[PDB]
Amino acid sequence: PKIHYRKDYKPSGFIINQVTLNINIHDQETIVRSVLDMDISKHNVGEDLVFDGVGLKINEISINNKKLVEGEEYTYDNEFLTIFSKFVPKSKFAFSSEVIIHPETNYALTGLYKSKNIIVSQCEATGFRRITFFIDRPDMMAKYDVTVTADKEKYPVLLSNGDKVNEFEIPGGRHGARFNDPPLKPCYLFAVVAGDLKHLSATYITKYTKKKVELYVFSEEKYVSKLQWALECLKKSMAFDEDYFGLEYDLSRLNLVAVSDFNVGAMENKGLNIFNANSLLASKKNSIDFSYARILTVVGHEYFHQYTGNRVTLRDWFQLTLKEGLTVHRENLFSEEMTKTVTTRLSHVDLLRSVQFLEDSSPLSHPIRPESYVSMENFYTTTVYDKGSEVMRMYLTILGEEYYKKGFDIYIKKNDGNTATCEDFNYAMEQAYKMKKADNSANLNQYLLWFSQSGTPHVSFKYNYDAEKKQYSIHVNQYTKPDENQKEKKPLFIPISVGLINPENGKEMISQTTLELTKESDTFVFNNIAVKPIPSLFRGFSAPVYIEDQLTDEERILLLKYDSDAFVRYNSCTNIYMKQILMNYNEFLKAKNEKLESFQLTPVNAQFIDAIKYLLEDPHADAGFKSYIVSLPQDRYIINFVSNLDTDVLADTKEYIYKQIGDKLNDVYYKMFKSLEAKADDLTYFNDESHVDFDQMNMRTLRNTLLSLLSKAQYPNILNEIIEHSKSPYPSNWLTSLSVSAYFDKYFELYDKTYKLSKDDELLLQEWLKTVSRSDRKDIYEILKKLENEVLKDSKNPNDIRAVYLPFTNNLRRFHDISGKGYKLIAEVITKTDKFNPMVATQLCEPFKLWNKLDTKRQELMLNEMNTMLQEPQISNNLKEYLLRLTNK
C-alpha cells in the first residue's frame, strides 16, 4: 500500500480541459465512452501519462483517434493505465476510451451502481476512476458534457450536472439525454442518476438578484409522499445562507435525490445532491422524530457545500477539513437557528465529547489535517468533520458575528473559483482579527496548531478571591498528552467564553468576555468583583477541550440551577455525575477485586437530587434540557476517564446511581410523564406535512426518557402506561413502547405488533431493527439470530446491516460479555461485509475503537478478533489498513 504524504503535493504535468461522456446503460452492463481534451502543463517533464482507473474492462483506448496497442504503447493493471511517454503528444490532444462496468453487481456503492431500481453514481473521493479513466484528484478541473442513454421504461428520468440540452429517442425502446455543464469542476462532483423517479418541486426566488431557482426532490414512486419536509428544509437552507452569509444559489435548478443503498448520509455533486433515503425521507406516520432534525441537517449540509466545497475547491484531500469542518460549522449554525432549542448545540457537544474524544485518545488519533493517508475512504472521520467544525466555530467565537462574517466574505470573495488550503482560511480570519483588534501586528499564526496538532487539550482552573480588594483571579493551565504524532505538544490558542455568577441572586457580574489563553498558563484578574463569584466556564463549549472546572458540587449545583448558559448548566450536571461515577466505580471495583462479603457505596448527593427535582418541576424550564439532566453521561464519554475499564463494573455503577435517583424521584417522573402527554402527543398538525415543532418533539423525548427510567425501575403498574403508549400514532412513542417493554413479559407481543406497523416502509423497518437491536434483553443473542433469519437475511443494504448490529454494540453488559461472543459476532459481520462493501465493514469496526481502554481480559478478547480479521486472506485494503492502525501494528 502506497502512503500519500501531505508534504509531497505537486501539480499534475497534464491538463484535462474537457470531458465528453456517453454512458450507455444496458441490463447486463454499462458501456462508458469518454473523450478527454487534454494538454501538457507547465509542470510536465516528459513523464508517462498515468490515469486512474479501477475495475474497468477496456474495449479500446486511443490518442487523437488512433487506437493504442496494449503491451507496446500502454499497460493496465486494473488500477493505473500507463501510456508510455513516447506515445503521448506534446501539445493539445484528445484521449478517448471505451470501457465496460457493471453497476448491477457493484455492491461497494462507490462509482456507478444500482440501488434497487435506480442507477446512481458516488464519486467522492476516488469513485470517478471506477467509472472511466481520469487523473482522479480534486485539483484537475474540467468542463463536462454528459450523455446518458437507457431503457425508457426502466429509466424514464435521467439526470446529471448542468443544463439538460437534448433528449432523444433511441431504437429498441431506449432514450437519451445530454447535459452540459460549462463551469469547471473536479471529477468528484460529477454525478448521474437514472431511474423511475417521482418528484415534488417548488420555485425559489433569490433575495438579491431575484433569480428563479427550480427545486426538485426525487424518490422512487412508493415513497414520494415523504419528500415534503426535505423540500421545506432546502428552502430554509437557501434563506439561511442568504440571511447569515449573503450568499445566493448560482444555478437555475437544484435536484435532491433519495436512494435506498448509500454508504453515508449524502453527497454534494453540483446541482445534483444524492442522499441516503434515511436522510431525505420522512412522514409523521412512518418516521421517528429524529428523522426531522436529521433531514434538516443533511439537506442544509449538502446545500452549504455549494460554496464551501463546490465554488471554493480543495487543492488536495489533506485539506478535507477545510470543506467538511467548515460546512459542518455552517450546518450547525443553521440547525441551531432553525430549531431554536438549546439541545441542538448540546447534542453536537455530546457527540464530540463521546465519539470524537474517544477517537482522539485512540491509536487512530490524527489532527484535523493529517500528514499522510493510505486509504481516502477512511479519512472521513469525526475528527476531520466534528473537531474541524469546532475549530471553524472557534473563529466565530474569537471574532464575533460582524468580524467573523467579514472574514468569511474575505475568504469567499478571494478564493471563489480557485482551490484553497487551510492557511488561506486562516489568513482570511486573521485579516478580520487585525480589523477587530485594530492593529496589524496581531496575527493568528499560533491558531494553525489546531490544524496540525492531534489529541484533546486539557484545560484546568484554580481561583482566588480577595474580599477586601474585590479582586477575583482565574488561573488557567492547558496540557495536551503527547501521542504518536507529536512527542512535544505546543500550547494552543484557546478562547474561553466566561461569565461570573453571583451565588446570592444568580446574576451576571461581568459583561460577555472571552479569555484568549495563548500560553501554557495564564492568570486572568478581574477588579470590582463585589462578592466571590461562581465562574461559568467555556460557555457554549467554546473550545474542543477536556474541562477541569475544579468546582465543588455545591458550586456546580448553583450553576445548574442559576447560570444563563445551557452548556455550562449541562456540563456542571455532567461533572457532578462523573465525580459520582468514578467514586462508585472504584468502590465496586475494590469489592470485586478483594472478593468482599460486604462493603459500602457512597450515595448520590442529596442536594444534587433536589436540584434535579427543582428543574423538572419548573413549568418554564425546557423539556429537552430536562431530558439531558436525568440521563447519565454516555458510556463512551465515561471511558475517557477510567483506565482498564471493566464494563461490568461500569454497568453496576450506572445501575446504582440510576436507582439512587429513581428511589427519590420516580413519583416526580411519573407525574410529569402524565402531565406532558397532552402537549407532547398533540395531533393538531399530524396531517400537516410541513409543520415541524422541535419543542414538541423535545417533550416526546422527555416523556420517552422518563418512561424508560420508570420501566427499568419496575414502577408500580407502569406496564399499563407502556401498553397505552404502544397505541400512539407517533413512531417515536410506539417504538419506545417496544424497548421499554423489554423488562416485561409483554415484550414479544409488542415486538410483533410493532414489526407489523413497520414492515411495509423500508425506513421504518430499519428503525424497528435498531429498536430491537438496542432492546435491553437477556435473550438479546437469540433475538439477533431471529432478526438475521427472519428480516435481515442476505441484505447488502448498509442501512439494514448497520440497523441490526450497531445499536446492539452499545449494550454495555451484553455486547461486552466476558466470553467474547459479542466481539466474535461483530467480527464475523465485519468480515462478511468486507467481501462486498469495505467502507461499511470499516464502519462496523467502531466498537473496537476503544479496545485498548478496557480491562485486560476484554483488551485481549477484542485484539484476538481484530487479529483474526487481519488474517483473512481476502481482506480489503481498506479494512486491513484500518485494523493495522487500530491495533498498533
Ligand SMILES: N=C(N)c1ccc([C@H](N)P(=O)(O)O)cc1
Ligand atoms: N467517501 C465517502 N463515503 C463520502 C464522503 C463525503 C461525502 C460528502 N463530502 P458529505 O460531507 O456527506 O457532504 C460523500 C461521500
Ligand SMILES: [Mg+2]
Ligand atoms: Mg436576595
Ligand SMILES: [Mg+2]
Ligand atoms: Mg430493501
Ligand SMILES: [Zn+2]
Ligand atoms: Zn460534507
